[PDB]
Design an enzyme around this catalytic site. Sequence first.
Site, mmCIF file in Angstrom:
data_model
loop_
_atom_site.group_PDB
_atom_site.id
_atom_site.type_symbol
_atom_site.label_atom_id
_atom_site.label_comp_id
_atom_site.label_asym_id
_atom_site.label_seq_id
_atom_site.Cartn_x
_atom_site.Cartn_y
_atom_site.Cartn_z
ATOM 1 N N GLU B 98 -88.129 46.427 -2.857
ATOM 2 C CA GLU B 98 -87.663 46.268 -1.456
ATOM 3 C C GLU B 98 -86.496 45.264 -1.179
ATOM 4 O OE1 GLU B 98 -91.035 46.388 -2.457
ATOM 5 O OE2 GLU B 98 -91.008 48.579 -2.077
ATOM 6 N N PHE B 174 -98.532 54.369 -8.680
ATOM 7 C CA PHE B 174 -97.140 54.336 -8.888
ATOM 8 C C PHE B 174 -96.763 53.457 -10.066
ATOM 9 C CE2 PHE B 174 -94.569 56.260 -5.232
ATOM 10 C CZ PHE B 174 -95.582 56.990 -4.641
ATOM 11 N N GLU B 179 -93.850 53.268 -13.505
ATOM 12 C CA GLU B 179 -93.254 51.987 -13.783
ATOM 13 C C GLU B 179 -93.543 51.509 -15.220
ATOM 14 O OE1 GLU B 179 -94.757 49.834 -10.431
ATOM 15 O OE2 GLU B 179 -92.977 50.056 -9.255
#
Lengths: 251, 251
Positions: B98, B174, B179
């Site tokens: 982010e 996720f 990842e």
Amino acid sequence: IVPTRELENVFLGRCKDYEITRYLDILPRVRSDCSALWKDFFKAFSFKNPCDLDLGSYKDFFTSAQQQLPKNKVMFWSGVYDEAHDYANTGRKYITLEDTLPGYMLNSLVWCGQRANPGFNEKVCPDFKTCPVQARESFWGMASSSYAHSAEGEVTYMVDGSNPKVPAYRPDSFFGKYELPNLTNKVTRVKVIVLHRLGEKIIEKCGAGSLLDLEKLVKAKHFAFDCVENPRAVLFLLCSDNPNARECRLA
Amino acid sequence: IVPTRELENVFLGRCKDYEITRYLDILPRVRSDCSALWKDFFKAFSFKNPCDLDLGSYKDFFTSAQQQLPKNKVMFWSGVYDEAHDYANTGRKYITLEDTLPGYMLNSLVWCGQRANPGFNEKVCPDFKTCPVQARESFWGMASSSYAHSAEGEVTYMVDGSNPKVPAYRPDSFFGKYELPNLTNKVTRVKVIVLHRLGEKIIEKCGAGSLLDLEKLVKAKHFAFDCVENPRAVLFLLCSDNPNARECRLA
Ligand SMILES: NC(=O)c1ccc[n+]([C@@H]2O[C@H](COP(=O)([O-])OP(=O)(O)OC[C@H]3O[C@@H](n4cnc5c(N)nc(F)nc54)[C@H](O)[C@@H]3O)[C@@H](O)[C@H]2O)c1
Ligand SMILES: Nc1nc(F)nc2c1ncn2[C@@H]1O[C@H](COP(=O)(O)OP(=O)(O)OC[C@H]2OC[C@H](O)[C@@H]2O)[C@@H](O)[C@H]1O
Ligand SMILES: NC(=O)c1cccnc1
């Protein structure tokens, strides 16, 4: 100093970003378009000498930009920018000037007028300590003024009690110049929070020195007054950045 | 569930603001200008049905928008968005997705395509759980792959250890899908931080259950591995928010 690049683009971008997505549940929407905002903001300083400005230059802009603020939630600070905004938590516990439309659009930006086309300087902006005070504080002084003026109920003030060279409360801070004197009879109480930086010699204490002066001024506005030093929740914030401090030891 | 209004203006405004003023000391600028970025983004979903996407749809965009990331500062998170972002401190301690350009522009936003003009839907966006997984996870799955793939040195992963219903490490998260499997030999170590929420029963511990599986998986790829529960600096952020918990008792 070097002025911000593509000033209009950055202004309009932050303005659209905020309008559509920022603080939606916390502060109300402004009533003006971003172009109208830009137009009042630009004509405040443009086509004039960088020091021609005074306390009225940005009045129309701030009239177009002002937001009604949540009761009991408003925060002021001096000398503790990082700690106050960390503790405010982006509008969730308290609101700071920087969470409102005008602070968030111009926060950290650099700009100035000149007299030739195109009416602003893209190259250089004078160190602002070179201008008369009404001109070096034209923008951020009126900002702090409107903001304080809109506060209702309880307000909070965070300050540094560990600075040997700067009193916790000074009449010449932005808070002392612009904020305190501008609060209305809609304000009921002032709650001061004294930061004792960890590992360091305590310099100010509640009710003694400049905090005792502040106390007397606050009671003179017929407002309530309280004052605390390292309240636990704030102490825990400090401890997180210095988990070894003696102040941080747990049972 | 309603789509973001003026998507393009928000996207472009966020892009410009980030370009000129955000993370300037912390992350590099991308080569590609904002309108070129917008192009690549919009062609991914435009003029197709909402569920007509896969993992390669946003590929050209992410290629354009990818930044090198500073060594040892990459963090991942599952189940603890607020706590991880508070502790990462806007790039000052750890970087999260982010804080990067593409995550910064699209965070919180909602959009989907449609076959008819304008090529995107301004009224509604199908409860994405209606769509095949490769469509539902086309944007943020590709965001996570690209981000992980760019990581170097030590990386950190903050997880929830108090959720009876959701294990600390899951292959279907996720982190597990996108990842960890994409970390390159440039990564040397995976450092896990396990969060125990104050006053909630402790469900997961280092060296047991899913964390044990995680340790072995990470041993396979030939990274070092460590793990810690409620380390002091994280613990104090938690107490800041619940100062009266038994875990925050001061000596
Ligand atoms: N958001 C703001 O920038 C902002 C600015 C002023 C007042 N506010 C309100 O008044 C109180 C903070 O001013 P304060 O009580 O004076 O506490 P501080 O820690 O001393 O802050 C001055 C420092 O900011 C820096 N600064 C930035 N711009 C300027 C400027 N034009 N001119 C000058 F001189 N300094 C600036 C400057 O480097 C200086 O070292 C808060 O309640 C806040 O609502 C917010
Ligand atoms: N298609 C989707 N699109 C968006 F925007 N959000 C979605 C989608 N599907 C589920 N979500 C939401 O997205 C969250 C997935 O979070 P958690 O489950 O808490 O951790 P994890 O799964 O590991 O994914 C966070 C890790 O993936 C990369 C990132 O840098 C970090 O390392 C859930 O809270 C869920 O509400
Ligand atoms: N910010 C997000 O919604 C998000 C979702 C999934 C993975 N990474 C980020």
